[PDB]
Each structure stands twice: as structure tokens, then as C-alpha cells.
Amino acid sequence: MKAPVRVAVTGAAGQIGYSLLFRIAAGEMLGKDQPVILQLLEIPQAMKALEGVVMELEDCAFPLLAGLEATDDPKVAFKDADYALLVGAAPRKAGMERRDLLQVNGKIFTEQGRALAEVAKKDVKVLVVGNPANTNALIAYKNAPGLNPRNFTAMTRLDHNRAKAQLAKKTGTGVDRIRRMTVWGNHSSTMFPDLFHAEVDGRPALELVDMEWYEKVFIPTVAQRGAAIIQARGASSAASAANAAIEHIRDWALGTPEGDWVSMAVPSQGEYGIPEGIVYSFPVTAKDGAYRVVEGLEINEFARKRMEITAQELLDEMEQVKALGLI
Amino acid sequence: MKAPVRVAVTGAAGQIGYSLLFRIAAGEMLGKDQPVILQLLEIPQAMKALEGVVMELEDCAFPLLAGLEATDDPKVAFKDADYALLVGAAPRKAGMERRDLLQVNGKIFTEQGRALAEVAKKDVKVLVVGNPANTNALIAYKNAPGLNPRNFTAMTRLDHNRAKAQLAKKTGTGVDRIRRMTVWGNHSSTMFPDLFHAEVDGRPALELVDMEWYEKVFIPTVAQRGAAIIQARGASSAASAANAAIEHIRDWALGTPEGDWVSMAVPSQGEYGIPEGIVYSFPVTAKDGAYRVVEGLEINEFARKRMEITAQELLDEMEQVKALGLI
Ligand SMILES: NC(=O)C1=CN([C@@H]2O[C@H](COP(=O)(O)OP(=O)(O)OC[C@H]3O[C@@H](n4cnc5c(N)ncnc54)[C@H](OP(=O)(O)O)[C@@H]3O)[C@@H](O)[C@H]2O)C=CC1
Ligand SMILES: NC(=O)C1=CN([C@@H]2O[C@H](COP(=O)(O)OP(=O)(O)OC[C@H]3O[C@@H](n4cnc5c(N)ncnc54)[C@H](OP(=O)(O)O)[C@@H]3O)[C@@H](O)[C@H]2O)C=CC1
């Protein structure tokens, strides 16, 4: 058995946490032979509920759960953390506007970024799920001087998975036969699901589906999927989002399949002309903790335009945050 | 390489289902080498919500999910089923007496038992989670002509795991080092957690903990655990219950560890003098998809008394459903 790794998870008493923690403790994120120590964080008002989650975790009698600790102190939750999943974010209460939301998120991620830089492992892998994910990750790494900025990522894997699901459904093929899907940019509605390099059973996706469907059906449907789940279930897609978070960390820590790639929002270094610094989703391959953007892909006008649009939205968000003195 | 197996799950749009289905699709219940076809059942009023669950499952892009179908017809959900998890049960309505709850469940499980006997695989493995689990399982198998009564079981694995967790905590040992825990009888408050044969790192449990703690702390705590979760979280322990359901089916199908055993409520054949027919939790081992009660265990007066009390409660429940003409 490998030495235990410490996995910090914030917003632990929430919906995503409830669908995330058990699978992590079961070994679904880092391997069935990798013991994990869960270090859970919540706000003071949710600590009672978190104790309940702690009890449920204990009641699963997980052989890989080497340790379990709940706290409301980021410096305790992130202490010696190998992984940190930042799920908690500013909730939209009545009266609050975007700018107000950014203020609160600014405080949350500046504090957590500083806490991570102060007490976590130097190579701690960070995934931001709390929205707005890309910008929150930016706030976090900018306030985490002393930590590799590339270790601060944002989640787009749910959109990535939803895109694969839609393509599989349309072509009548198993989702396991869909490869090289790419979601570029922001986690938002400007998110761009790329089918130009995707393959279905080895065949180019655009040889099986046409541009009309791609533009008028595929894109809108992937973008509205979250809302579709809420309209049907009456609750947010916590389980599939948790699954995506697990895969995001898993494929990064372990590795992506040969000849395939995944989507991850990471600090740009200028790849594909994307402004440097902003956290942007790119097609990436990964191996044992290290990822690399798949550069060199041919980009047509349809993709370029959409990649530019989402890049601009991220730039504007960055400027808004900069104007607030958060970075 | 292995052909897909069909897994039917009722009450699929509920809380337990939400914590259960994703892990089944991920291969956590029947093996990472075993494709599964999920056949989900709900009542008509919950079909829209079930559609939402279906969408979330699709959005996980599970390579092992070979099929996914939602229906409100038991004869469709159970068609050629290899496994059936009966989670849906009568809701606790206001001004609704216990007996009234039994009548509603009588209709539900009489119909499902009949459906299973008509369209499922003859060797379908059934687990009843919906409460009252033991009695609902009794109603189901007694209404499943042509099917093996021993293939109808009820869940006590959550109580079993909770007992292991409490023992681990008290002795300061990893839960992975706790073996031979037993929970006897009904899924209810009369459930009897047995430490007389349990071992901690190979050492008898009662050599590490005293009888006073066992009687006045351990037993009540295991019995009140569900309520503890609710008081802390404000919601039932769906995640850990789902985990227990998964382990119940998993160990039954894949087998129990050498030198260890688990708890399963199964139709009694007179083991330990327990009246025949009632679905009673016994310590059991499993191999090649079949289980066998662990007989030969020494039963002192303390245990005998408690085993008798819970057996009597099950007999009383049996009498009540018989009086309602359900069996
Ligand atoms: N530990 C800490 O520092 C903090 C903890 N919290 C805690 O975090 C918890 C938030 O829980 P709850 O309200 O249930 O939220 P959820 O678990 O449902 O959501 C948490 C975050 O994930 C985002 N998200 C992204 N994709 C999805 C998706 N598909 N489904 C659901 N959420 C998604 C949400 O954005 P969106 O709003 O758009 O859904 C939100 O920012 C609370 O328990 C709160 O007390 C809050 C702040 C700081
Ligand atoms: N498909 C069908 O034939 C039917 C489907 N249903 C559907 O079943 C679903 C019930 O969902 P919901 O109300 O969310 O219920 P839950 O998923 O929380 O509970 C379902 C069953 O599990 C039992 N249970 C046992 N242990 C636990 C535990 N630790 N935590 C929670 N439940 C536990 C419950 O008993 P307890 O009540 O004591 O918690 C209940 O009978 C509804 O969606 C309903 O529409 C209903 C009837 C028939």
C-alpha cells in the first residue's frame, strides 16, 4: 500500500460534496491501493452538518480511509495536503449582484490560496469547482505565491463528459468509443465544445454528424444541460459534477489514455494565442501528476471564433477582479 | 469480455438511488470487468425526475454502462433482470398508521414479486432496501411463484458497517482490521449487534472492550445512528445506505473474505432455531453467487435473549401482513 495522501475538500457538507466524498474514500479517484486521509472544510454554520457527513463516511467502513478530519479552518484543512478540491464558493442570496458575489468569492479564494501556499505540500494539486471556477482559480493562484501556478486548475470535465454523451447518443455508439473531445475556454455558456478532432470508433466525428446539428443542437444542448437536469429533478447535477471532479483529478494524477486527451482549465502560457495568465480550458494529456496542453492542432474559423469569444469573457472577468483589487 | 448483466433498481429517483446508481455504473458493485445495463423503475409521478437521473448517468460517460432504461412498469424494469434492488417503498404519509403503511407496501411488493417471477431471470438476486425491509422481502418472495425464496434478501449491512465503525473507533484500530461482526434479526431497533465472535486484529473484541460499554453504549449507539445522521445533516443517511446496498450485492456475488463473514437478512431455514420463513439477519459467507449461514457459533444467554426478541418482532410483523392477506 502506498503511503496515505491527504485530500482536502471544501464545501464538504454541500450537494457536490455528498456525491464526491464517498467515491474518493472508496478509491475511485486515486486508485484502489492508495489510502486517503480526508481533510474536510466548511463554514462555521455548516460544521454540524459536516459532522453528519463524517459519520456517514465512517459508516461505510472504507478500508482506504486512513484518516478523517473536519474543520472550519483552511490552515487545518490544507495542512500537508497533496490534493485540494475547492468546491465551496459564494452562494447567491437575495439582493446580491455579480459584483457583490465577486467580492465574497474574492475573500474566499484569496484566503484559501494563501492558506494553501502556507501549509499544503509544495506540489499540491488544486481543482476549483466552486463557481465561477476559472476566475476563482485565478484569484487562488495569484494569491498563492510560493506554489506552482500550473497546479491551480478549474473544472470543465463535466461539460467535456456531457459533450461525449451527446455525440454518443447522436451516432448511436457507446460513449466508450468516443475520443479526443475538447471543451475550450470558460466553464460558462461561452464554453466551446470542439468536435473537429473528436473520433467515434476511430472515425472523425464530423463524418458522422453535420455542421447544422453541431451548431443548432449540439452546442446549445451541452450548454443548457445543467438547467435541463434541474428542470427534471428539481435539483442541481451534483452527482455527475462530482464524477467529473473525480475524473479531473484521476486523469491528472494517474494519466490520460494513450492516443486520447481530456479537457482541463489551466493557467495559459500563450498556447493557441490565448492570453497568458487566465485559466482557460485546453485539450491536455497527463501522466503521473503532470499535464501538457495538446498544441499543434489545426483550428478552423468556426473553432477560432468561439475560442476568441470565451477568451474575451475570461479577460473581462480578470479585469473586473483586478479592478476590485483581488489580483 | 464478460457479457452485460441487467440490474433493476426501483425508487430510482429518490435519495438512496441518487447515491447508488452512479457507483453501480462505475463498476463498484459487480466488478470493474462487468458491464451493467441499468433498468430503472419509478412511480408515474416521478418519471420526469427519473429522466433527470438518466441524464446525469449519461453525463458521467461510464464505460461499463452498456444500457440504460427508465420505466414505470415493473414488468419492463425486471425483464431478464440478473439483479433487482427494491428501494422504493410506501412513503410515510400524515395521519397514516403503521398498519396503513404495511397495506401500501403490501400492494407494492406483491406486484413486484409477481413481476419478478414473470419476467426476471429465474436466478435473479434480489435485495430489498425499502422499509420495512425484512417484511417487504417476505411479501415479495411469497408472491414470487417459481423463484428461489433464498434469492430474496433484505439489508442489514448498514447496521453491520456501523457496528464495525463503532468498534474500530472504541479500540483505536483501523476498520479494515475488524472481522466477524454480526447483526442478527430485524432491520429495526430490535436489531442485535453481536461482538461475541468479532475480532480486532485477530483478538476477541470483548478482550478489548467491556460488557458494560457493549450493552449500554455500543448497542444503543448502533441503533440510533440513523437518527444521529438526521439530527446532524437534516437528511437521512442515503449515501452510507447506498454503500451498504452495494456491499450487500457485491459480497453476495463476488464472495466474502476468507475467515470473515458479513450480515444479510435472508429467509430462515431454522438456523439457530429461528422460525422458518421470516427474513432474518444472520452471519453469512458467500461464494459463486450463493450464500450460507455461518452455523455452529456459541450463543450465550445475552445473545439468545436478544435474538429471540427480534425474532418475535419479525413474527409479529409476519402475523400482521398475513392478517392483511398479503401472504
Ligand atoms: N469551506 C469553505 O471555505 C466554504 C464552504 N461553503 C460551503 O459550500 C457548500 C455549498 O453547497 P451547496 O449549496 O449544496 O452547493 P453545491 O455543492 O451544489 O455547489 C458548490 C459549488 O459547485 C458549483 N457547481 C459547478 N457545477 C455544478 C453542478 N453541476 N451542480 C452543482 N453545483 C455545481 C456551484 O455553482 P452554482 O452556484 O452555479 O451552482 C457552487 O459554486 C455549503 O455547504 C457551504 O456552507 C461555502 C463557502 C466557503
Ligand atoms: N419504483 C416503484 O415501484 C416505487 C418507487 N417509489 C419511489 O421511491 C422513492 C423513495 O425516495 P425517497 O423518499 O427519497 O427515499 P429514500 O431513498 O431516502 O428511501 C427509500 C427507502 O430506503 C429506506 N431506507 C433504509 N435505510 C435508509 C437510510 N439509511 N437512509 C434513507 N432511507 C433508508 C427508507 O425507509 P424510511 O422511510 O424509514 O427512511 C425507504 O423505504 C421516491 O422517489 C418514490 O417516488 C415509491 C414506491 C414504489
Domain locations along chain A? 2-154, 155-326
Give phi and psi for A131, each to the nearest 5: -85, 150
Give the C-alpha distances (Å, rounded to integers) separating A133 from A57, A92, A127, A130, B193.
27, 15, 9, 5, 46
- Evaluate the CA torsion angle B221, B227, B229, B231 in order and state its sign: negative
CB proximity A24 to B under 8 Å: no
- From the list B289, B197, B189, the residue with the least C-alpha distance to B249 is B289
Decide: B82 and B46 in contact? Cβ < 8 Å: no
This structure's resolution (Å) is 1.6
Would you name the residues of B annotated as active-site residues?
187
Selecting from B19, B55, B237 the residue whose C-beta is nearest the C-beta of A229 gives B55
Are A232 and B52 in contact (CB < 8 Å)? yes
Contacts of B289 (CB under 8 A, 6+ apart): B123, B125, B252, B253
**Three-state SS for A155?**
coil
Phi, psi of B86 (to 5 degrees): -90, 95
B119 alpha-carbon distance from chain centroid: 22
Amino acid code (one letter) for A323: A
Q: Which amino acid is at A70?
A: A
Looking only at the bridges linking them, the beta strands covering A125-128 and A36-41 are unpaired
**B212 shares contact with chain A (CB less than 8 Å):** no
Query: Residue A225: nearest ligand to its CA?
Result: 1
How was this entry determined?
X-ray
- Look-up of cell digits 458497517: B161
A183 touches chain B (CB under 8 A): no
Cis peptide before B132 (omega within 30 of 0): yes
A180-183: Cβ within 8 A, 24+ apart: A180/A260, A180/A261, A180/A283, A181/A263, A182/A261, A182/A263, A182/A282, A182/A283, A183/A156, A183/A159, A183/A263, A183/A281
Cα first-last separation, chain A: 41
Residues of B in contact with A175 (CB under 8 A): 58, 61-63, 65
Cα torsion A22, A28, A30, A36 to 10°: value is 30
- The residue type found at B195 is L
Of A83, A85, A87, residue with least CA distance to A131: A87
The residues with which B40 forms a beta bridge, in sequence order, are B9, B70
Q: Residue A60: its chain B contacts at CB < 8 A? A: 161, 239-240, 243-244
Widest distance between CA atoms in chain B: 54
Distances from the Cα of A211 to the Cα of A207, A214, A222, angstroms: 10, 5, 15
Task: For residues B172 and B313, give the distance between their C-alpha atoms in angstroms, rounded to a whole number.
Answer: 35
Q: The sheet that has A203-204: what strands, in order across it?
A: A178-179, A199-200, A203-204
Which ligand has its closest atom nearest to the C-alpha of A233?
A: 2
Cα distances (Å, whole numbers) of residue A277 to A99, A108, A187, A293? 21, 20, 16, 15
Nearest one of A292, A320, A306 to A214, comparing CA atoms? A306
Is residue B161 within 8 A of residue A25, CB to CB? The reply is no
A147 contacts A112 by C-beta, under 8 angstroms: no
Output the CA B43–ligand 2 centroid distance in Å.
Answer: 12
Three cell numbers, residue A142: 495569484
B151 is in an annotated binding site: no
Cell numbers linked to B16: 438512496
Contact B49, A234 (CB under 8 A): yes
Return the ∠ at Cα B236 (arms to B230 and B238), rounded to 5°. Answer: 145
Closest CA to A132 of A155, A116, A152: A155
Task: Please count the other Cβ atoms lying within 10 Å of the Cβ belonging to residue B12.
Answer: 29
Long-range pairs of B216-220 with CB within 8 A, sequence gap ≥ 24: B218/B163, B218/B166, B218/B167, B218/B170, B218/B193, B219/B192, B219/B193
Residue B270 CB-density burial (10 A; 0-12 exposed, 13-18 middle, 19+ buried): exposed
Q: Quick one: angle between helices B157-171 and B238-254, nearest 10?
A: 100
Residue B18: φ, ψ to 5°: -65, -25
Which chain B residue has its CA at the smallest distance from A248's CA? B60
If DSSP codes are grouped into helix, strand and coil, which group holds residue B312? helix
Q: How far is the CA of A272 from the centre of ligand 2 (A)?
A: 51
Backbone CA torsion sign across A233, A237, A238, A244: positive
C-alpha cell at A310: 470565451
Q: Which CATH architecture has domain A155-326?
A: Alpha-Beta Complex (3.90)
The residue whose grid cell reads 408472491 is B143
A270: Cα within 13 Å, side-chain hemisphere: 0
Instruction: Give chain B positions within 8 Å (CB) of A229.
Output: 52, 55-56
Window 132-171 of B, Cβ < 8 Å to A: 158, 161-162, 164-165, 168-169
What phi and psi values does residue A36 have, to the nearest 5 degrees? Answer: -130, 150
**Candidate of A71, A224, A236 to mutate for ligand 1, largest count of ligand atoms within 8 Å of Cβ:** A236
> CATH topology of A2-154 equal to that of A155-326?
no
Task: Return binding residues of A for NAD(+).
Answer: 11-17, 105, 112, 129-131
Contacts of A115 (CB under 8 A, 6+ apart): A74, A75, A77, A78
Q: How many CB atoms lie within 10 A of CB B213?
A: 16
**Which chain B residues contact residue A45 at CB under 8 A?**
none
Decide if B192 contacts B223 (C-beta within 8 A). no
Matching residue, cell 430489498: B128
Q: What cell numbers appear for B240 in the block?
A: 452510507
CA distance A110 to chain B (A): 29
- How many residues can be counted in chain B? 327
Q: Are B310 and B186 in contact (CB under 8 A)?
A: yes
Q: For residue B220, how many other CB atoms are within 10 A of its CB?
A: 11
Q: Which helix (H) or strand (E) holds B182?
A: strand B182-184
User: Sheet containing B83-86: which strands, arranged edge to edge?
Assistant: B65-71, B36-41, B5-9, B83-86, B125-128, B152-154, B262-267, B279-287, B290-293
Closest by CA to A66, choosing from A30, A101, A36, is A36
Asked if A26's CB is within 8 angstroms of B22's CB, the reply is no
Ligand located closest to B116 CA: 2
Distance of CA A312 to the CA centre of its chain: 20
Find out whether B122 and B51 touch, Cβ atoms under 8 Å. no
A193 lines ligand 1 (CB under 6 A): no
d(CA A8, CA A109): 14
Residues 260..289 of A with a Cβ closer than 8 Å to B: which? none
A187 is catalytic: yes
Q: Is the CB of B41 under 6 A from ligand 2?
A: yes
Distance CA A127, CA A247 (A): 11
Helices A301-323 and A133-142: angle between axes, nearest 10 degrees: 50
DSSP A84-121: EEE-------TT--HHHHHHHHHHHHHHHHHHHHHHS-
For domain A2-154, give the CATH number. 3.40.50.720
In angstroms, the CA B204 to CA B179 distance is 10
* Helix-, strand-, coil-residue percentages of chain B, each rounded to 5: 45, 20, 35
Residue B234 to residues A13, A53, B245: CA-CA distances in angstroms? 11, 11, 22
Question: Listing from the earlier edge strand, what are the strands of the sheet with B199-200?
Answer: B178-179, B199-200, B203-204
